[PDB]
Amino acid sequence: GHPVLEKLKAAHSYNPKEFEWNLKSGRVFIIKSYSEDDIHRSIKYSIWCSTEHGNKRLDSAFRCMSSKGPVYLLFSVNGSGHFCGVAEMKSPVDYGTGVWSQDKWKGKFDVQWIFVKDVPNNQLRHIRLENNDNKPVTNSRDTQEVPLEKAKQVLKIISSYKHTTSIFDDFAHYEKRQEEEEVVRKERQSRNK
Amino acid sequence: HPVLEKLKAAHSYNPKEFEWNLKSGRVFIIKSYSEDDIHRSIKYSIWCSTEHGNKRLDSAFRCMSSKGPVYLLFSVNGSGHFCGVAEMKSPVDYGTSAGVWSQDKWKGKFDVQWIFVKDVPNNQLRHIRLENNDNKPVTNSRDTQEVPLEKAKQVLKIISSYKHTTSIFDDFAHYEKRQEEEEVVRKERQSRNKQ
Numbered sequence A: 001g002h003p004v005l006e007k008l009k010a011a012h013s014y015n016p017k018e019f020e021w022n023l024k025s026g027r028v029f030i031i032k033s034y035s036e037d038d039i040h041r042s043i044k045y046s047i048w049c050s051t052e053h054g055n056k057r058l059d060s061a062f063r064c065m066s067s068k069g070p071v072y073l074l075f076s077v078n079g080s081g082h083f084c085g086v087a088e089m090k091s092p093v094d095y096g097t098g099v100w101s102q103d104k105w106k107g108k109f110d111v112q113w114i115f116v117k118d119v120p121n122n123q124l125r126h127i128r129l130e131n132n133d134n135k136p137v138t139n140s141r142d143t144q145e146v147p148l149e150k151a152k153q154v155l156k157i158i159s160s161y162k163h164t165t166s167i168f169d170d171f172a173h174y175e176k177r178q179e180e181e182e183v184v185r186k187e188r189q190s191r192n193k
Numbered sequence B: 001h002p003v004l005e006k007l008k009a010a011h012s013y014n015p016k017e018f019e020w021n022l023k024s025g026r027v028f029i030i031k032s033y034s035e036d037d038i039h040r041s042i043k044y045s046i047w048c049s050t051e052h053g054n055k056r057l058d059s060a061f062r063c064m065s066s067k068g069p070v071y072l073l074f075s076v077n078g079s080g081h082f083c084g085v086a087e088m089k090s091p092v093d094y095g096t097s098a099g100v101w102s103q104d105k106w107k108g109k110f111d112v113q114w115i116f117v118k119d120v121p122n123n124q125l126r127h128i129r130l131e132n133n134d135n136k137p138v139t140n141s142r143d144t145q146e147v148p149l150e151k152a153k154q155v156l157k158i159i160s161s162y163k164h165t166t167s168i169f170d171d172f173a174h175y176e177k178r179q180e181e182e183e184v185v186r187k188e189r190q191s192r193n194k195q
Helices: A003-011 A036-045 A052-064 A148-160 A167-192 B002-010 B035-044 B051-063 B096-102 B149-161 B168-192
Strands: A027-033 A071-077 A082-089 A109-120 B026-032 B070-076 B081-088 B110-121
Touching: A003 A036, A003 A167, A027 A036, A027 A052, A027 A148, A036 A071, A036 A082, A036 A109, A036 A167, A052 A071, A052 A082, A052 A109, A071 A148, A082 A148, A109 A148, A109 A167, A167 B110, A167 B168, B002 B035, B002 B168, B026 B035, B026 B051, B026 B149, B035 B070, B035 B081, B035 B110, B035 B168, B051 B070, B051 B081, B051 B110, B070 B149, B081 B149, B110 B149, B110 B168
Parallel strands: A027 A071, B026 B070
Antiparallel strands: A071 A082, A082 A109, B070 B081, B081 B110
16 A cells, blocks of 8 residues: 555554444434545544534534544545445534645544445445435435434444445545645645735 | 637637626625536536525526526635636526536536636625625625625626636646546446445
8 A cells, every 4th residue: 555554554443343333322423525535634634524514513412422422423425326434523623723725624623533445335225214204324415313223234334344445545546636736726826926 | 728628619708898787686605615616617517506505596596587697706615716707597407417417426506607717816805795794705705695786796896807817727637637537536446346
């Protein structure tokens, strides 16, 4: 793998062989990401940012779960056909202060990435959310909460899946994307000044 | 870039004459999540807002049933500039065919006609304030905030008449490469995930 990727894997325990999916407590939410660049940035820097309204929903869930159970986030990129990983929410939302020229977010919270692996939606499409009109979990919108029993089923399948690919297969590609976009925006800013 | 040429063959951008003194119409701020969205919008003459944002624009367009135009003032989140103006040209389509226009990144689409493609810094506009957004500057608006018609005329006049030094057109090959390289990655991921 890419050498930065080598050290990221070294510092974290991605895709653990033993993960407790039969949660006694917790809250679980779907994250519908706009792009794989967000996911790549999220894994590299251990942070997430939803919309303004999604941030408020997740922040409130985290604060009502204080020292009482995990908040897990199940990640899927819009249009990708796959779930791409799982992280735990680890801080409240900090709405604090170049968001555009460096393509960062207008706020952030800490996440601990746990699973980084592509799971086809057809592997999960059979699980239905009674609190979303019994639609399949794979048709959820961003920050949809998953009832705990259904979340347990989804987490067992993602943890046990023997994936053939993950966003890590394109690590250098997403590094180059981010770098080139940052130069482009900096230049565009410069000329406008 | 050639695609930029096929576009200029079909449309004329930044007209030297544009009526900014609107007799009628409704005008909305559009806040884009990225430059990639802006590039895709200019290329395929489409847009898609949030679910809530689509309902607001759809209702507005259907209510303006030829009585007047619906203009969209575009700004990428965090950018410090506005980057163009388009006219909304259709209602929202949520159909099955809608997704192919965005490779399923968007839940749907509606047609737009881009008119101005030019970077206009917020400091040319921050003095225009919105009595329907608590008198905040028009440049601190959120996605699909409606602009009162008189204030919209002021904004449209400054955008039309501003001597811009750059536009997203100047990065067009960049965003073309971004779209193809990404699409290659997407196909390869899907292939490798079929066994």
